[PDB]
Amino acid sequence: RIDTESAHSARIYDYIIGGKDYYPADKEAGDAMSREWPALPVHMRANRDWMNRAVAHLAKEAGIRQFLDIGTGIPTSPNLHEIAQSVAPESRVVYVDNDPIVLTLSQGLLASTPEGRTAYVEADMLDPASILDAPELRDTLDLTRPVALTVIAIVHFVLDEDDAVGIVRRLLEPLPSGSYLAMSIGTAEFAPQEVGRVAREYAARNMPMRLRTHAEAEEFFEGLELVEPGIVQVHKWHPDAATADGIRDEDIAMYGAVARKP
């Protein structure tokens, strides 16, 4: 099932951020991409750090106790549920990915506090019903209470013919008032040549990307209430004292944003 001879996006990301869950094809891809854009590891680490700050905000400040994470990727410490459950042990998280390697690594995702619950669903976001009607999900989350929908480091792999904005908003539909949408969205605006070349290395390896402008990112959040500072480069979203240390704008190719559903 794993297909170790071709590169996969989750495995390249893990290779670059220092994990072990990758194969030679993933290393070759990551190394080629870093040659085009030396900041690639700074970008990928900053996206992970952003997830950590966004989930902590959602759990602590917003009081959210249920999360639906679309495109979970390779488990990496701390995982989303470990952050949420440290704030409130009763928190519940459903993780979702379509890369078969994630299923093989799913024990760490399933290691919940006793007060809380977690589950893992192998599914494709192109079929929202397969996610929303999954028994693992319906046994885990109560969709009559607020949920944070997290769609992090995935949407740029959905090209326009499948309507990424529509898919995301279809997943948000069943979540009640007071739910949230949190996303990171890939952009070429801050380093067009280097990021463009990286995107073309992904396309050459059968992972075409759709990078977006700020205006295009805004489409996902129409009708929702953005948390300040709005849609900004990830290292500028609620930074800690060290968040942007030595990081230039050109070194970051993700927008991040969190918004409340009225």
**125 labelled ligand-binding:** yes
The structure's method of determination equals: X-ray
- 45 belongs to an annotated ligand binding site: no
The answer to the question of whether 97 is labelled as a binding residue is yes
69 is in an annotated binding site: no
The burial of 28, by beta-carbon neighbours within 10 Å (0-12 exposed, 13-18 middle, 19 or more buried), is given as middle
Residue at 176: amino acid letter: P
Report helix, strand and coil shares of the chain as percent, to nearest 5.
40, 15, 45
Residue 225, helix vs strand vs coil: strand
178: left (phi over 0), alpha (psi -120 to 50) or beta: left
Domains and CATH numbers, the chain: 1-262 (3.40.50.150)
Residue 65 known to bind ligand = no
DSSP 153-211: S-GGGS-GGG-HHHHHHHHHTTSPTT-EEEEEEE--TTSHHHHHHHHHHHHHTT-----
